[PDB]
Amino acid sequence: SMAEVTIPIIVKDTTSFYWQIVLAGARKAGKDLGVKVPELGAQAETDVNGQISILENAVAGKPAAIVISPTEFKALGKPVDEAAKSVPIIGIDSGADSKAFKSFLTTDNTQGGRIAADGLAAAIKAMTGKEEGDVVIITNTPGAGSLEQRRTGFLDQVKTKYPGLKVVADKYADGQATTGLNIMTDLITANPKIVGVFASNLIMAQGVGQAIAENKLSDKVKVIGFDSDDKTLGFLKSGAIAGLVVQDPYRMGYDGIKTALAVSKGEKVEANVDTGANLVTKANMSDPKIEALIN
Ligand SMILES: O[C@@H]1[C@@H](O)[C@@H](O)CO[C@H]1O
Numbered sequence: 001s002m003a004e005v006t007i008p009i010i011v012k013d014t015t016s017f018y019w020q021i022v023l024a025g026a027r028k029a030g031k032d033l034g035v036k037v038p039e040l041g042a043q044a045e046t047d048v049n050g051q052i053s054i055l056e057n058a059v060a061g062k063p064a065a066i067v068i069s070p071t072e073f074k075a076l077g078k079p080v081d082e083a084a085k086s087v088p089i090i091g092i093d094s095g096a097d098s099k100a101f102k103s104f105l106t107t108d109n110t111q112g113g114r115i116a117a118d119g120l121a122a123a124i125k126a127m128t129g130k131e132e133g134d135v136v137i138i139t140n141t142p143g144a145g146s147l148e149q150r151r152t153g154f155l156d157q158v159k160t161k162y163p164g165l166k167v168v169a170d171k172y173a174d175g176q177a178t179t180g181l182n183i184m185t186d187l188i189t190a191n192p193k194i195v196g197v198f199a200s201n202l203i204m205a206q207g208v209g210q211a212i213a214e215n216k217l218s219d220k221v222k223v224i225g226f227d228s229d230d231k232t233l234g235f236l237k238s239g240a241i242a243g244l245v246v247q248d249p250y251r252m253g254y255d256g257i258k259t260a261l262a263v264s265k266g267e268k269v270e271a272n273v274d275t276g277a278n279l280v281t282k283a284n285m286s287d288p289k290i291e292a293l294i295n
Pocket residue numbers: 012018045093094140144146147200201202203226227
């Protein structure tokens with residue numbers, strides 16, 4: 001509108017429940033603060049070109065600022081540098097190879113991987129009495145800032161703290177839950193010693209959880225996932241998933257827009273905001289802080 005600035009938000013994938021939570025936050029902020037917030041994004045996290053094109057087009061429209069969740073770390077570096085020459089850019093969720101961001105709101109993704117490692121070890125110990133056995137990691141797609149950090153944090157913690165755990169597979173999907181499902185089924189049928197799995201985002205949690213639920217493997221294979229939705233929360237209760245590391249996507253959207261507005265007015269903002277991570281299990285999913293995060 002007239003006399004009201006425009007601050008687009010560009011998410012990785014508009015069809016994902018996780019990104020829909022981010023967009024809900026951004027939307028509410030737009031309403032609260034009197035900012036027009038176009039809700040932008042490709043329909044797949046793997047559509048990196050799609051995101052770059054959307055960023056270029058949003059830049060060309062001369063908005064006051066842009067909030068973006070860069071879909072791939074290296075590929076978004078230069079596009080963000082370019083955008084930043086004319087529009088301030090606020091990052092959320094997942095890093096890019098650019099120092100041009102005015103602020104960044106994100107989970108500490110390396111710590112999130114460490115938290116997942118601890119949760120997986122604990123789950124294996126409850127099942128078997130000890131922290132030993134073959135485990136796997138399954139990652140939605142390669143090259144994402146958030147996911148590569150979760151992978152690192154997990155692998156590092158396993159290596160130093162859980163020497164009885166052996167990482168026997170480190171697999172990447174193509175951004176689809178069904179591929180997660182198929183990878184999980186393939187992995188286990190081939191290596192029946194697998195006792196544990198880290199599924200490092202919502203999409204992989206959906207697919208891996210589905211594989212464990214459908215095959216009645218909850219008492220043999222412990223899954224730690226990320227994020228939350230109806231399906232994955234169902235798996236947490238049913239036992240198909242042992243734990244979910246839950247982030248604050250609503251705040252990333254809300255405080256992303258709020259921060260971008262402040263930057264657009266020339267206000268000094270914090271460079272980095274840690275939006276937090278919590279391991280959610282059956283034992284704590286009703287804790288009031290947690291309930292507010294998983295709804
Ligand atoms: O934060 C991640 C996001 O970067 C996307 O890759 C997957 O869903 C969320 O876990």
